[PDB]
Symmetry: C2
Subunit: 363 residues, 2 copies
């Protein structure tokens, strides 16, 4: 009646902390933790690591063996739609009950047919936070979008018009690598590719102590690189396409040149002489992208904000002031209905070396 | 002797806390706190309240009376008449957090007491004490006021802070708090002509410090300083009809009748503009400890380019304001480092310092 809940919250927390270990590698699959308990002891633990790799339940089940019979399997996300039954468990505690299918949304009850005690809703908020992007793609058709911005004190960027993105500091660079690494994809404009010739990869060495936990060097997963170039200005000789992993171009007309194996291309309709960002997002949704980290110059960020597609703002502020000639999405207007678009609230603020990071979500 | 270090730390902390109670009403005098201890018991406490009123040590000594005879006084600033009071009330030991900065020739205060057979030290929490009087200490050391430049911003850098600010109540309350502790508030005539502000502290807009020092009848209106080199401000603008003084930084004498509480400061031009450096120097001679700047982009920028800004206080609103209302600075061309950052209602406030 009472101590059961006290213990329930203990083991679910444990199952949630395991699910997290998969957040770098799991895409397009969600994160899932599973903890099997018999007589106050964990007989089996597991989390989903990679799309083709075994489910969390499978991992924990293999571990528990015949010791599973007893009772209580703590899961992060409703199973099925199986082995949990064939390994005769009693009680199962689910945190969440399966997003989109909705037609198949109580495979939770399939275990009840086997006489298995079930229940859901434990720390559902935390399990929600754990799969923000995946869960968004399922409910809506849209990937979850984090917009990174490098600004000075007076708003403003890079001192020059060039759509080149300001990195503000090495610490801010190190901080972005970690956020990059849990994104399904990274998005940028062809202008940024032309102005910076960047790799837009994750570099394992730039990660910290999450180095120790999962993500050993060999497991490193490169987020999918997405480039917007309607006018096909990016060359097959640009660094970005030479990096390991796929790189997808969002272009208007198919490119005639010879591009590396890893290079793909999505054709996107226009909207007032410009590539339609809303269509593209949705298109990326169909293509199973959970979450996008955007390395935007002035134009891209503005267009995303005005299209109401951004879920989160991450603003890195350098302790500098910039002159008139400084570009800045800031002082320099361009946009009209930002005041009348999904507004954001502050969520976290932190020092990041000489910079500060302002974390904003639409909320 | 480690427990004595522990006791000293406690009593100095307390003296610092006491000193802080005068931060709203002490200008041009520093904030000073004193705690007298007589074998383990606090027998006298005191802090400075106002330039007209007595020094912290005198308050504390008055409370201790005969109890001061025994031993230790904790002062947050070396004492300087007022040094006879300490010697006359035969203390053993005074512990000062820092020595006087006015200048390095004044540092004699402690040596005066040591001749009387008092065991003296200095340096204990000389850092907190330093933070206690930034403006005053800077003036004494460099005849310049400590300048704090406030800025109000949307996420897209657009000037978004005029009392109906697109920022927030909480942020408006915060500014009042910070205004309340500046010796002076400085603005441009451009802001005066545009907004017609009072530039005062409204006591009701304060919180729990309502109860501290600072009952409503002790309200000290910070000195209003306005830059109009072209004498465009009028004697009928709200700012001059407020309690307290307003000082006009002028290039040339105005000819109109102004209330008795108004002054002008004649400031030379430097290449076509009023020389801000000389103004700050002159505000220094005028004993201005500290200046809270509430302006617009032009002035915010001239101060920044002159090298006169000691700290930035940047309020950012979680609003997105593209074309609405302009940018924060002009900068036709110091640098900064972040200190405290904090939430203020739905806004964030980022503090920065020169170095």
């Amino acid at each position: 009646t009472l101590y059961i809940q006290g213990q329930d919250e203990y083991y679910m927390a444990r199952a949630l902390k395991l699910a997290q270990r998969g957040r770098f590698t799991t895409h397009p699959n969600p994160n899932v933790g599973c903890v099997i308990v018999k007589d106050g002891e964990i007989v089996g633990e597991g989390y989903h690591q990679r799309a083709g790799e075994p489910h969390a339940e499978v991992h924990a089940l293999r571990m528990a063996g015949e010791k599973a019979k007893g009772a209580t399997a703590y899961v992060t996300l409703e199973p099925c739609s199986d082995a949990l039954i064939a390994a005769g468990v009693a009680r199962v505690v689910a945190s969440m009950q399966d997003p989109n299918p909705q037609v198949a949304g109580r495979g939770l009850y399939r275990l009840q047919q086997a006489g298995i005690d079930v229940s859901h809703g434990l720390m559902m908020s935390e399990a929600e936070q754990l799969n923000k992007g995946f869960l968004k793609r399922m409910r809506t058709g849209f990937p979850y979008i984090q917009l990174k911005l490098g600004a000075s004190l007076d708003g403003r960027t890079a001192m020059a018009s060039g759509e080149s993105q300001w990195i503000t500091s090495p610490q801010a660079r190190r901080d972005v690598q970690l956020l990059r690494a849990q994104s399904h994809a990274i998005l940028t404009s062809s202008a940024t590719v032309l102005a910076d010739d960047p790799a837009l990869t994750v570099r394992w060495s730039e990660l910290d102590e999450q180095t120790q936990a999962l993500y050993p060097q060999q497991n490193l997963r490169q987020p999918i690189r997405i480039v917007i170039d309607s006018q096909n200005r990016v060359t097959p000789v640009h660094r970005i396409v030479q990096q390991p992993g796929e790189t997808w171009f969002a272009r208007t007309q198919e490119d005639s040149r010879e591009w590396p194996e890893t290079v793909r291309t999505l054709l996107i309709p226009e909207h007032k002489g410009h590539l339609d960002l809303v269509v593209l997002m949705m298109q990326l949704g169909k293509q199973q992208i959970n979450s996008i980290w955007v390395e935007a110059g002035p134009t891209l960020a503005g267009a995303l904000l005005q299209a109401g597609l951004v879920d989160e703002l991450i603003v890195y502020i350098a302790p500098k002031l910039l002159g008139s000639d400084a570009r800045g999405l800031c002082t320099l207007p361009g946009l009209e209905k930002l005041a009348d678009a999904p507004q954001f609230k502050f969520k976290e603020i932190r020092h990041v070396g000489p910079d500060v990071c302002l974390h904003l979500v639409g909320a």
